[PDB]
Structure formats: structure tokens, C-alpha cells
Amino acid sequence: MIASLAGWGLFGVTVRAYQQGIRKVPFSYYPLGYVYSALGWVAFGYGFNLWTERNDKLLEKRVEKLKESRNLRLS
Amino acid sequence: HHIHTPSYIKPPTGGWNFTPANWKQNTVLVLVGFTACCVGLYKLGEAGSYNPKLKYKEEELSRWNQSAK
Amino acid sequence: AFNLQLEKEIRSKIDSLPKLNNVTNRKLSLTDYLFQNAANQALYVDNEADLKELDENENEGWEKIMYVGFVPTMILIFAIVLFKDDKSIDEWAMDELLLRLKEKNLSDVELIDELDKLSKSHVGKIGASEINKRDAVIIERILNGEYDQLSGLKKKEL
Amino acid sequence: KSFLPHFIPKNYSYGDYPRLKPENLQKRDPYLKYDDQANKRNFNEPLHPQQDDLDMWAPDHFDFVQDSIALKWFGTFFGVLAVFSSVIYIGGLYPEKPANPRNYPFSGLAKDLGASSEEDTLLYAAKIDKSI
Amino acid sequence: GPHLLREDASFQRYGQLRDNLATYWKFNRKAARNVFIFLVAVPAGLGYLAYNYEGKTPFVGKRRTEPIFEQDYVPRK
Amino acid sequence: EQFHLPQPFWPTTKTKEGEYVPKDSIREASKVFIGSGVLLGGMHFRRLMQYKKGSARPGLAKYLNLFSLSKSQLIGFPVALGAFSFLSHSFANLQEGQTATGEFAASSIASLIGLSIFRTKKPLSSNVAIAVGMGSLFGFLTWAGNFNLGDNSYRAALEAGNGNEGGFDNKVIKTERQGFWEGVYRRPLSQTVEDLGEGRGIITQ
Amino acid sequence: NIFNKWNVTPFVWLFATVGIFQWDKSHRESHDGKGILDFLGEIKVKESLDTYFKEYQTKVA
Amino acid sequence: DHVRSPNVSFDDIDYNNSQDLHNAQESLLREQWIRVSALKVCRKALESCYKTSGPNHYEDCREIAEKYLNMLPDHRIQGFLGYQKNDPSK
Amino acid sequence: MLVQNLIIFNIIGIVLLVLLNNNNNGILNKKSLLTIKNELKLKQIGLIISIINILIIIENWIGFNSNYYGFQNIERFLNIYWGIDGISLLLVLLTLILGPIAILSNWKNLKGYYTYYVISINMLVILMALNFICLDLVSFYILFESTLAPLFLLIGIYGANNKNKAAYYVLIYTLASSLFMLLSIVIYYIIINSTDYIYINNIILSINLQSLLFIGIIIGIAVKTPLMPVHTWLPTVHSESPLGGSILLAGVILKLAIYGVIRLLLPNLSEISMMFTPIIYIISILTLIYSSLITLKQTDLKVIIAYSSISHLAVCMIGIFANNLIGINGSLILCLAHGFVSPALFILVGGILYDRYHNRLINYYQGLSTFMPIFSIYLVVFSFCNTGTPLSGNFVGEFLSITGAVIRHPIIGSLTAASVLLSACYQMKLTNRLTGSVFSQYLHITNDVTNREIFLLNWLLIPTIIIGIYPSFVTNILNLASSTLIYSVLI
Ligand SMILES: CCCCCCCCCCCCCCCCCC(=O)OC[C@H](COP(=O)(O)OCCN)OC(=O)CCCCCCCCCCCCCCCCC
Ligand SMILES: CCCCCCCCCCCC(=O)OC[C@H](COP(=O)(O)OCC[N+](C)(C)C)OC(=O)CCCCCCCCCCC
Ligand SMILES: CCCCCCCCCCCC(=O)OC[C@H](COP(=O)(O)OCC[N+](C)(C)C)OC(=O)CCCCCCCCCCC
Ligand SMILES: CCCCCCCCCCCC(=O)OC[C@H](COP(=O)(O)OCC[N+](C)(C)C)OC(=O)CCCCCCCCCCC
Numbered sequence A: 001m002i003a004s005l006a007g008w009g010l011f012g013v014t015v016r017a018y019q020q021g022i023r024k025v026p027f028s029y030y031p032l033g034y035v036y037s038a039l040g041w042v043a044f045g046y047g048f049n050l051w052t053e054r055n056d057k058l059l060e061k062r063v064e065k066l067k068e069s070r071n072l073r074l075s
Numbered sequence B: 001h002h003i004h005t006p007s008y009i010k011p012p013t014g015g016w017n018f019t020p021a022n023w024k025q026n027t028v029l030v031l032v033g034f035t036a037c038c039v040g041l042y043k044l045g046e047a048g049s050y051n052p053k054l055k056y057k058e059e060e061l062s063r064w065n066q067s068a069k
Numbered sequence C: 001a002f003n004l005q006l007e008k009e010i011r012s013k014i015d016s017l018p019k020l021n022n023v024t025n026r027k028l029s030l031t032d033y034l035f036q037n038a039a040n041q042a043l044y045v046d047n048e049a050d051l052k053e054l055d056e057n058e059n060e061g062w063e064k065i066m067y068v069g070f071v072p073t074m075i076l077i078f079a080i081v082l083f084k085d086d087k088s089i090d091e092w093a094m095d096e097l098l099l100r101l102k103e104k105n106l107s108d109v110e111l112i113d114e115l116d117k118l119s120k121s122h123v124g125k126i127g128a129s130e131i132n133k134r135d136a137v138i139i140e141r142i143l144n145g146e147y148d149q150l151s152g153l154k155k156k157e158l
Numbered sequence D: 001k002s003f004l005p006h007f008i009p010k011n012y013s014y015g016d017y018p019r020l021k022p023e024n025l026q027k028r029d030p031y032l033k034y035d036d037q038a039n040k041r042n043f044n045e046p047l048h049p050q051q052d053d054l055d056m057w058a059p060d061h062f063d064f065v066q067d068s069i070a071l072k073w074f075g076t077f078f079g080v081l082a083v084f085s086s087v088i089y090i091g092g093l094y095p096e097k098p099a100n101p102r103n104y105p106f107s108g109l110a111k112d113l114g115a116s117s118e119e120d121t122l123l124y125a126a127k128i129d130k131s132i
Numbered sequence E: 001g002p003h004l005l006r007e008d009a010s011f012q013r014y015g016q017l018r019d020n021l022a023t024y025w026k027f028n029r030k031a032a033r034n035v036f037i038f039l040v041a042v043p044a045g046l047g048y049l050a051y052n053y054e055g056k057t058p059f060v061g062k063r064r065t066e067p068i069f070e071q072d073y074v075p076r077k
Numbered sequence F: 001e002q003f004h005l006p007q008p009f010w011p012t013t014k015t016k017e018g019e020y021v022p023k024d025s026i027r028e029a030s031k032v033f034i035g036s037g038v039l040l041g042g043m044h045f046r047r048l049m050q051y052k053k054g055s056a057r058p059g060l061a062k063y064l065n066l067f068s069l070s071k072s073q074l075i076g077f078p079v080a081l082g083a084f085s086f087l088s089h090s091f092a093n094l095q096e097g098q099t100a101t102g103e104f105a106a107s108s109i110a111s112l113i114g115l116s117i118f119r120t121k122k123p124l125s126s127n128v129a130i131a132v133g134m135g136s137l138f139g140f141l142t143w144a145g146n147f148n149l150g151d152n153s154y155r156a157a158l159e160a161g162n163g164n165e166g167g168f169d170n171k172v173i174k175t176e177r178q179g180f181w182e183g184v185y186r187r188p189l190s191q192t193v194e195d196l197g198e199g200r201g202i203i204t205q
Numbered sequence G: 001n002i003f004n005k006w007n008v009t010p011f012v013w014l015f016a017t018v019g020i021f022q023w024d025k026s027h028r029e030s031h032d033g034k035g036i037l038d039f040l041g042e043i044k045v046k047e048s049l050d051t052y053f054k055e056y057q058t059k060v061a
Numbered sequence H: 001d002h003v004r005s006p007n008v009s010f011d012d013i014d015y016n017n018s019q020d021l022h023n024a025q026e027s028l029l030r031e032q033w034i035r036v037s038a039l040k041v042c043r044k045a046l047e048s049c050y051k052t053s054g055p056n057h058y059e060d061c062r063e064i065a066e067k068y069l070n071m072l073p074d075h076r077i078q079g080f081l082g083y084q085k086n087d088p089s090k
Numbered sequence I: 001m002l003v004q005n006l007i008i009f010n011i012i013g014i015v016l017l018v019l020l021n022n023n024n025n026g027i028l029n030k031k032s033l034l035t036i037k038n039e040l041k042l043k044q045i046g047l048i049i050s051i052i053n054i055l056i057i058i059e060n061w062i063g064f065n066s067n068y069y070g071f072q073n074i075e076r077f078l079n080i081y082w083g084i085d086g087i088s089l090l091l092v093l094l095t096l097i098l099g100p101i102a103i104l105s106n107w108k109n110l111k112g113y114y115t116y117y118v119i120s121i122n123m124l125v126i127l128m129a130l131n132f133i134c135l136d137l138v139s140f141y142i143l144f145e146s147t148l149a150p151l152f153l154l155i156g157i158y159g160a161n162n163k164n165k166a167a168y169y170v171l172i173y174t175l176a177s178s179l180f181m182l183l184s185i186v187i188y189y190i191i192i193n194s195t196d197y198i199y200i201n202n203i204i205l206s207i208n209l210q211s212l213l214f215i216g217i218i219i220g221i222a223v224k225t226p227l228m229p230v231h232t233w234l235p236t237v238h239s240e241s242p243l244g245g246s247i248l249l250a251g252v253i254l255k256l257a258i259y260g261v262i263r264l265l266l267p268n269l270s271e272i273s274m275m276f277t278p279i280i281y282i283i284s285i286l287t288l289i290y291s292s293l294i295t296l297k298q299t300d301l302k303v304i305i306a307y308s309s310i311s312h313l314a315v316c317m318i319g320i321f322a323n324n325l326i327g328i329n330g331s332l333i334l335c336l337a338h339g340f341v342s343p344a345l346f347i348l349v350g351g352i353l354y355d356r357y358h359n360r361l362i363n364y365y366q367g368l369s370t371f372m373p374i375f376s377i378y379l380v381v382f383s384f385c386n387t388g389t390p391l392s393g394n395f396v397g398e399f400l401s402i403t404g405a406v407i408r409h410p411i412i413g414s415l416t417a418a419s420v421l422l423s424a425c426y427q428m429k430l431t432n433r434l435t436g437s438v439f440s441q442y443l444h445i446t447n448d449v450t451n452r453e454i455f456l457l458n459w460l461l462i463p464t465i466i467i468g469i470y471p472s473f474v475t476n477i478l479n480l481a482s483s484t485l486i487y488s489v490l491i
């Protein structure tokens, strides 16, 4: 799961780096902002992964019922 | 004679009556170059060429016509 | 190689000529564009604008990239289309045709003799050419029967 | 005497673009000096909307006679060569063959001309020599 | 740069007009006649040639099934 | 033999021969013509009352001028709508159903009739240009199946088993043509000859 | 100078290509016809490529 | 080495088998390219017969020319889509 | 490996150029050090990135099997399947080779903002290259239309006097027409639940539904080739777009329409394509003939070349809709040959003459051979390539395309031979004038072709002649991929 959270933190680095361009400051200005931004999107990324993992479990349970519903139709 | 503007117009073919000062030196090199691979054309041609009327015997062709019949 | 002491000489001399629009021992490195202080970078451009002001179509900065990266890339492309061991479908089909001729005529003394002595390089040169080879029986057998199996795949007729 | 080429409008209306009589520049006096001697044009001369049809690079305009006269002469010429052809054909003035045209043995060389069997003889045979 | 081209006002006026012919185009009877010919008449002519001979020309390895030369000669007298 | 042209037409229910009781064109056009003239004329005299009630208020006057209809529009609009209803029903009776060509003809003629009444002070070619544009819009409206395909939609077909819910199977071949929304793995070669014809690679060369 | 940078270049390309061309033929005399570029890597075969295609079409279904 | 044609017909497979339909498509393509190879060999015989026979080419190469003119219409690539999507017997 | 590396590497390249060139925006008012020599370092990094993209496709080419039927290098990335065949492989390499050429053609003829231009060029190249390796209809449409965003801004910022007209034309002609192609893609996803290439290729739809789907797709394709009568955007866009924009538009963007026929029409709508071929041939033949006669009357140098491109792409459309291998291979070779000659003619006409005299009116130029002999040699050489003179890849493409049309339709396909006459009429009318008579009185003598412009012309001419003399370099790769597109049942 580290690889997924690694990308989310890298997304947060991009968000901060893009913000520096908006505010017209050097990208090395206040380096702690990248650390703050990286962790804020790792937190969102971890919650996002739980959301998607839950969705796949729920989708399988609903699909089983849908297949039984379709088998009756195909007759 | 005229003005050929040869200061900056130097096409591969010469530009208005151009003969370089060292033309004798270059002519021998080109004549050597022309002669050298003119023999190369001859050596390649003798190896690669063939007579298309002698590649297959007339007896080989009679079998072809009957087999394809 | 910023060499700040060298710019000061260059900057001062342009000051000896107050009029405007009326050095080869200078170079920069890759690490200079990112690490020099903001004061020094300003000085270099002020000279570069003024040095260029005091002035054909060469040393434009692209020649090294194209002749070290691009031309070898096209050479590599030229090599691949020349010396890559890749069969095409038409070249495969000719080899397959000769293979099936061998399998249909195993009891053929004459044909297998020519097939074995027909080298792999002359497979695509069958017929009349400069190469002196015996394919008369090989051509004779292809003209006799049909060695494709297309009729065996269309099992439905009209 | 000198007439404009075809498909040259006698009037046009393109807003404020200057309206001028079309001048075929090919006909300009070549012994005058011009700023563009090859094109026979002076600098800043207004161009007709179809000037590309009325300058040196356009196809040459021959005007020795009118087109209808040239077309009438052109038809008159080839009409004579057709009347001459038609008089001989209808009257049949061309000579007859002095000999029966050439014939060949072996059923007119039918076998030598790609005939398979007797069903395709006259398909490929040349004229047949009936006298063995 | 150094203005290496001697700009001609009449050239510029002529070139500007040739780019902007669309402004003055009127869909009159003359324009309608050319529109009909180029976009209706000619496409219809090719339209009927394409579907008339759609699959009606088996010209691959087409054979000769009829003699070319006459066997006998008949004089005209 | 007929030319084999593509037929890009959305699916529609086709009435069996002997069906399609025709609709009275004059009676249907009468209701549209009379009802429109009553409303347009009635709303005209209602707005004249609003004029009399107030004419020194610019806000009311500006809004009333937008909705105001000229005299030739008060007559032309009911006539154009009445002719449209008559010609739409008249052509539909002719063709045993409604077609995009019939609606194109009915709308352009109805527009041209109305345009020649309430657009008298414009060139004739200008009125024809609008009428062709108006007629094309309604022909396109009919071609697209009016506001919805209804029983011919894929969702309707999917509920009737005429969709692709069960998938495909090449072993099954059907003599009858597949449904509009249905896809198959393999088809009878006779159907291809019916569609394309013989020739350039079908059966013969 | 007839040996300038522009005249020599086409000849340098020509001879080098012929040299590599003749080099390749000898390499095909000693490696069962395998070419001089065989060091870069060989060509993937149907069986190895079918498995990727089989897993690609299963997911699509 | 020299790969071989996996002889597989559309008539003996379920198209829902992704790998089996792929083989039938490949199988039909490879049999058509072989017929193109055979046609070229026959044309090679025609050219050699024509050159050698001289004025005798009409008689000497008659059956070779007849065979080439018969094979030419159908010894060309036809694709697999035509037979995959059409059942001739229906 | 291919798609993943081609996207990840270029994103790092895009971010790198932004980080370096935008670190000093904050009221520093400094002089920097990368801004010297027209942002030379930033230009050089982008030039290197373009060349490296060519190296990535090569690594996957070494393992390509020309004797394998089906897509290879099948990959999954961003929930999308990516694969390559013989047809796609050559178009990807053509697209990536033109990347460095587009950058180098605008090496020193931009008024400023070199980092923005280089990024957009590398961004246009990758999006177009990725369009040849996607394996579903929706991914095809995403990459088909994604290029509009950078192309619209590229024209409007770096364009000529009428750039505003040209930017609107490209955005509205192409977006409106492609939305009709999106309608057909939505229908496929509704009734089949997938847009995968292989999945939809096996399904036969009703002959009426195939007609509606064909028309939707053909509207998007016909505008982007372009064909008559929806071609009016191209001459306006080409005359105002920057030189690099014209090279990519004339070298890659137009070839996506032919690839659209190969993917979106031939294997899935096979039955209806045979029905539409006479209509396609009539439209294309008149596109070829009309564009050639219209080109005669043009007075703008870059518009003449733009109309020349329309005539040849009508021939490509004719070949690809032939149902035989000769026409399909001929259309593909003509696409590649055009992909080099057409950008070269824009460099000669809109990159060398325009950079010296800043005027594209034909009336100002004649007798250029007197003081520009090197320019005249390349102008004459590429003019004969553009008219399909033998020994050029254009002729091999044109001859097989015309032959494929004749085999497909002997009567009407014979009109395609007018390309031989008509192309030489307008191309040699322009070349005979630029190299004819006395050197123009409206021009001042200046420098001839420089080393950079010689380099661009040579490396667009070299592939054209190698393909022209030995096209089997291309036909071997295309042979098995093209044979799958033929639809016929001979009994
Ligand atoms: C004692 C007399 C009492 C009178 C009471 C009515 C007051 C006067 C109003 C004028 C009549 C119009 C309204 C009529 C009723 C509303 C329409 C209706 O329900 O249909 C009735 C009429 C006949 O249709 P019928 O088939 O008999 O009804 C169904 C039977 N199964 O169907 C019709 O044909 C009615 C005509 C409608 C067509 C004209 C209207 C369209 C054109 C004008 C548009 C008005 C502005 C647009 C409004 C929408 C704006 C977004
Ligand atoms: C100046 C800069 C210009 C632009 C440069 C572009 C840089 C791109 C950086 C990407 C970083 C990376 O790699 O992210 C990847 C990670 C980890 O992916 P995963 O969890 O394994 O999911 C697997 C991914 N599949 C499905 C492709 C396999 O996901 C992310 O963070 C997602 C990025 C957020 C996008 C916003 C949508 C999600 C929020 C939902 C709210 C509705
Ligand atoms: C558990 C995971 C999250 C942990 C951290 C989250 C709270 C961070 C607060 C730290 C203090 C702070 O923000 O301090 C303020 C700083 C600096 O501001 P500056 O603009 O440089 O001002 C200049 C300051 N001088 C003058 C002192 C130099 O701002 C930042 O660094 C902004 C980063 C905000 C990250 C927001 C993440 C949002 C994620 C949303 C997903 C849906
Ligand atoms: C493959 C997917 C890539 C996706 C990422 C796109 C790039 C992001 C750039 C953000 C940073 C930025 O705005 O930076 C600006 C940079 C560089 O400008 P500059 O010359 O340095 O600016 C001037 C500064 N001076 C004055 C100091 C020199 O402009 C770019 O990069 C432009 C690329 C985007 C153009 C196309 C937009 C299309 C939008 C919709 C896309 C579908």
C-alpha cells in the first residue's frame, strides 16, 4: 500500500509546487509547505483507498444478486 | 569581364566561370575517383549479370508445362 | 566556471565607452545556472547584452544535440530496417511452402536432394537469377499440386 | 486589333478596391523603361482583381486573328482531309489486294499460336492454307 | 528585421483582396449556377457512374473467348 | 437491379398494410387555425388594454413592444400554422404515415406562405431562404424521431429481449434479419448479398 | 578544398554502411544467419505474446 | 525457428473463446499468403519459359500461362473478416 | 513499458522546464541566467526530450515481430489497454521523428516565450503518438481531441496577423465534427458495453445501424483529413499557425484521419464500408480535382502548400478504402512520404522565405536561383517529390494508391490518375516562378540557406528517398497488419 500512498503524497507535492507558481514565489520558499502538503494528501489518499476497497466489496455482493436477476431474464 | 558577385554565391556547380586555382590537383583526384569505381561497376556487373535464356534447359521446361497441365 | 573576477574586467571595459551601438575566454557550466547568487547572475547578463550589442548563423546551440542524439538515432533506425532478424508474412509463407513440399514428397529422391542443397539465403531467389542453383524439380513439384490448406478451413459451402 | 483574353469581366465590385480597365500586361511596349522591366510594371501600379490572368506568368495570349477565325480555319483544314477520305471510301477508289492474303500450314499455325485442341483452332489460328 | 522586402502598396491591396473575396460574394443567379454545377451536377454524374458499374467489371485475368482475325477474304469488286 | 445505398434511418414502428386509419386534415387544421387566431387576436386586445392603462411608464411600454404583433403577423401566424397542420396531415395520409420528407415539405411551404404575408417588404429569395431553413429543421426533427424514440429506443428494446443482454454466439445463425439494436457474431451470406450485392469481392471478383 | 566537410560526408556514410553491410554477412556465416544486431535482443514469439493477449481479452469481457 | 500455421477454422470454434477466434483469424490469413507464394512461383516458371522458348512460347508455355490466368483472380489476400462474419450455407 | 515510460518521462520533462523557468517570477526583476540567448538552455532541454522520445519507441521496436498477427506490447496504464501493431508502429515513429524538427524549425524565429512553445510541441507530439497505441474507441477520442487545447493556444499566441481567425477555425471545425464521432462511440458503448478494438471488431450490427454509425464517424474523419466540402479550415490555419504548428499539422494531425479509418471503420463496420465506398471515392476524387484547380489561383505561398496537402490526402483516402492490399499499403506509404515532404515544403515556403522577407505574397518572389542557389536546389528537389516523381516515396504511395483504386473500381478509380497531371500543374507553376526570370526587384540580397535550415531539409529528404527506392522497409512491417482489414467472401 506504500506505493499508492507514495503517489498521493507526490500529488500533494505537486499541489504545493503549483501553488508557489500562483503566488509567484521561488519553489524553494518555505520548504515545510511541501511536507505539510504531502501529508495532507496522504491522509486523503489513505481515506480514498479505504473508500475504494469498500466499494469493490459492496460491488461484488450486488453483482451476485444482479447475475441471479439476469439469469431469470435470459429464459 | 562582368561582375559575377562571387564573394558569397558559391553553388556546387561553380557560379559564372569558376575555375579554382588548384584545379589541376583536384582534377587528378576526381579522375582517380571516377576511374577507381568505374572498375567497381565493371567488377560488380560481371559477377551479377546472367543470361536469362540459358538458366533453364528446354527439357526442364517441358516437364513444367506437363506438370502444370 | 563563472569566474566573477573575469566579469568585472568585462563589465568595466564596456563602461569605458559611454556611447552604445555607435571574450572568447568565457564559458559557463551546468551547475552555474542554478547555484550562483542573484547578484552575480544579473552581472553576467548585463555583460552579455552589452557584449552582444558591440557586435554568421553558427554556434546556435543545437548542433551538438542533433549530431550526438538525433543522427545516431536515425542511424539506429537505418540499422534496424537493414540488419534486424525479422521475418515478414510474405517471407514466412515462402519458407512454409517449401517445408510442406518436403513433407508431401518424403519418398521423392530428386526433390529432397534439391531442397537440402537449396540454401536458406536463396529461398527468396527461386527462379532465374545470377545464383546457379537447381530448383527445376522444386518448381516442377509446385506446378503439379496445391500445397495450401485454405480448402480445409472453409467447411461450409453454398 | 488587340483584344483581351476570355473570362475577363467587364465590371467588378469588391468594396472600395479600385476599379480599373483590365490591361493585359503581356502587350505592353517592351522598349519603355520600367521599375520591373521583366514584368513591364512600375512600382505601385494598381493590380486588376485577376491580374494573374493578365501578366507575364499567365499563358501567352495569341491575337493575330480572332478565336472564331482561328477555329474556323482549324475546322476548314481538317474538313478537307475528311472530305478527301470520304470521297475515296464511298467511291471505293482504293486498290484491291493483288494477291490472296498470306496463309499458313498446320491449320494456320494454330498450335504455334497457343491453341490447345481442336475446339480452339479458329480462336488462335492465322489464315489457313487450304492447299495443304 | 532590416525590411529586406520592398513593400508595394498595390501588391498589399491586391493580396489583401484575394484573401478576402468571401466578404463580397453574393449568392446571385451567377453564383447559384456555379454552385449547382460543381456541388450537384458533377457529383451526380460521378454518382451514377460509380453505382452503375459497382461490381460489374470483373477485369482480373479476363480471358479472350472470340477470334480477332478474319479467316477468309472477300474482294470488293 | 436497384442501387445498394446506405440507409441511415432510426428505427420506427411500421404499420401493417390495411392499418393507419387516416386523420381528417381539414378538421385538424381547423382547430389549430381557429384556436391560434382566437388566442393571438385575444392576446392582442388584452395588451391594448395594458397600453391604455399605462403609457407614461417606460418599463411597461418596453415589455409590451417586445410582445406586440403587427397586423400582418396577427393574420399570417394563424394561416401559417393552419397550413402547416393541414399539409402535415395531408402528406401523412398520402404516405400511410409521417416521414421526414413530408414534414420538410409541409414546414417549408407553411413557412413560405406565412413569410409572404408578414414579411412582404423583403426580397422573395430571402423568404425562400428562411423557408428552406425552417423546413429543414422540422424534417430533422422528424428524422430524429420527434422528441424521443419511445418504443424504438435501446432501453425499450433491452426490456423486450431485442437487445444484447444474453451476449452472442456464432453457432446460432438466423434467417430473419437481426433487430436494429442487436449484434451478432456471424450472419447468413445471403443477407450480405442482399445488402451489398455481388461484385467487387462478394462471391465473385 | 575538395575534401571539405560537406563533400566527404556522403562518402563516409556510404563506405561505413557498406562496411557494416559486409560485416553483417560474415556474422550470418558464423551465427546460423543471426544478424549483427542480435546482441540488442531477439523478437518475441507468438506463445509469449498470446498469453498477454489472452489476459487482455479476458479483462475486457 | 520457423513457426507454423495453427490450422483452425471458424466453423469448429466458439467465438466467445478469445484465443480460439484469434487462431482461426490467423489460420485463414496464413493460408492466403501461401497461395500468394505459390502464384509467384508459377509466374516465375512462366517468365523463364517465355525467355527460353522465344517464338515457341505460345506452345511451350501454354499450360503454365493457362494456370496463372486461372489462379490470379483468387490467389490474393482476401482477409478473414469476410468468412468470419458470413455463413455461406445459410 | 512503452506508454508508461513515454508518459512518465515527459511529465518529468514538463515539470522540469516549468520549475527552472518560473522560479524567478516573484518581483525579483532579476536578469536570471537561463533567459540568455533566447532561453538557450531551456530550448536545449526540450530538444533533448524530443530525441529521447524517439529512443523509447526504438527499444520496443527491437522486439517487434512482423510475423505475428495481433497487437503486441499489450500494456495496461491508467485503466487503459495500450498495444501496437505494424500500422501503429510506423505512425508512432513518424510522429516522434517530427518532434525535434518542429522545435528546431522555430529555434530562433519566435518573439519570445520559448519554454511555453517547446512544452506545447512536446505535449502535442506525445498526445498524437499515444493516439496510435490506444486500444479502445473512447481512448481514441480522448487523444483525438486532447490536442485541441494546446494547438488552440499555440496558434493564438505564436501565430501570424490573422491568428485569431485561425485559432477559432481549428477549435470549432474539429471539435464540432468530432462530437459527431463521439455520438457513434457512445452508441457502441451502449449496445455492446465496451469500446475495445477486438471486442467491437467481431460484432455485426444491423445494416441500418451501421449506416448511422458510419456517418457519425465519417463526419469527424472527413473534417480532419480534410475532405471537400469541410476543408475550409485548413488553408486558414496553415497560413497563420507558427512553423512548428504547420509541421505537426501537416505531418501528423492529418494522418490521424487515415488511422481513424483503419481502426474505427474497416474492422467493425465492414459491411457498411463497402456500401459507402462509391460515395467515398466520389467525394475524394472531387476533393483531389477541385483542390488542384483551386491551388492554381492562390496568391499566398503557405496557402498554396496547404491546398497541395489536401490533394494528396484525398489520394490517401481513396487508397485506404480500396479493399485490397495494394491500395491499403499504398495509402500508408503515401501517408509517411507526405509526412516528410509536406513539412519540408512549409520550411522552404514559410520558414526560410518568411523568416527573411516576412511576406507570403507570390508577386514578390522570382528568380531566386540567382542569389539563393542552395534554396533553389531543395525547392526544386522537393517539388518533384511533391508531384510523385519516381525515386520518391510519394510516387510509390501514389502509384499503389491509384492502382488499388483501379482494382477496386476500374471505371471511377481511373480518375485518380489525374493526381499525376494536376499535382504537377500547380506545384511546378509555383516552382517555375520562384526559380524563373531575373531576381525580384522587390527583394534585397540576403543570406542563403543556413546550416540549421540545411539540416532540416536534408533529414526530411533522406527518408523520402530511402522509402522511394526500397519501400520494403515499410511494406514488410505493414504486410501482416494490413491484410486483416480486407473484407471479401469469394465463392
Ligand atoms: C365558449 C368558448 C370558450 C373558449 C375557451 C377557450 C378560450 C379561448 C382560447 C382559444 C382556444 C385555445 C385553447 C383551447 C383549449 C386548450 C387546447 C386543448 O386542450 O385542445 C382543445 C382544442 C381541440 O382539441 P381536441 O382534440 O378536441 O381536445 C382533445 C380531445 N380528446 O385544441 C386546439 O386545437 C386549440 C388550438 C391550439 C392551437 C393554437 C395554439 C398554438 C399557437 C398559439 C400559441 C400561444 C402562445 C404559445 C404559448 C406557449 C409559450 C411557451
Ligand atoms: C506543475 C505540475 C503540472 C502537472 C504535473 C502532473 C503530476 C501528476 C502527479 C500524480 C501523482 C501520482 O502518481 O499519483 C498516483 C496516486 C496513487 O495511485 P493509486 O492509489 O495506486 O491508484 C491507482 C491509479 N490507477 C487507477 C491509474 C492505477 O494517486 C493519486 O494521487 C491520484 C491523483 C489525484 C487526481 C485527482 C482525482 C482523485 C481525487 C478524487 C476527488 C473527486
Ligand atoms: C494529517 C494530515 C495533514 C497534516 C497537516 C495539515 C495541517 C497543516 C497546517 C500546518 C501549519 C501551516 O499551514 O502553516 C502555514 C504554512 C506556511 O504558509 P505560507 O504560505 O508559506 O506563509 C508564509 C509563512 N512564513 C511567513 C512564516 C514563511 O502553510 C502551509 O504550509 C500550507 C500547506 C497547507 C496544507 C493543506 C493540506 C490540505 C489537504 C486537503 C485534502 C482534501
Ligand atoms: C502530458 C500531460 C501534461 C499536462 C500538464 C500541462 C502543463 C501544466 C503547466 C502548468 C505550469 C505553468 O503554467 O507554467 C507555465 C509554462 C511555461 O511558461 P513560461 O514560458 O515559463 O512562462 C513565462 C515565464 N517567464 C516570463 C519568466 C519566461 O507553460 C506551460 O507549461 C504550458 C503548457 C500548457 C499549455 C496548454 C494548456 C492546455 C490545457 C488543457 C490540457 C488538456
Ligand SMILES: CCCCCCCCCCCC(=O)OC[C@H](COP(=O)(O)OCC[N+](C)(C)C)OC(=O)CCCCCCCCCCC
Pocket (backbone or CB within 6 Å): B009, B011, B012, B013, B014, B015, B016, I369, I370, I371, I372, I373, I374, I376, I377, I380, I381, I384, I435
Ligand atoms: C537523377 C538525379 C540527379 C542528381 C544529380 C544531378 C546533378 C545535381 C546538380 C546540383 C547543382 C545545381 O545544378 O544546382 C546549383 C546550380 C547553380 O547554378 P550554376 O550553374 O552554378 O550558376 C550559378 C549562377 N546562378 C546563381 C544564377 C544560378 O543550379 C541552380 O541553383 C539553378 C536553379 C535550379 C536548381 C537545379 C536543381 C536540380 C536538381 C535535380 C532534381 C531531380
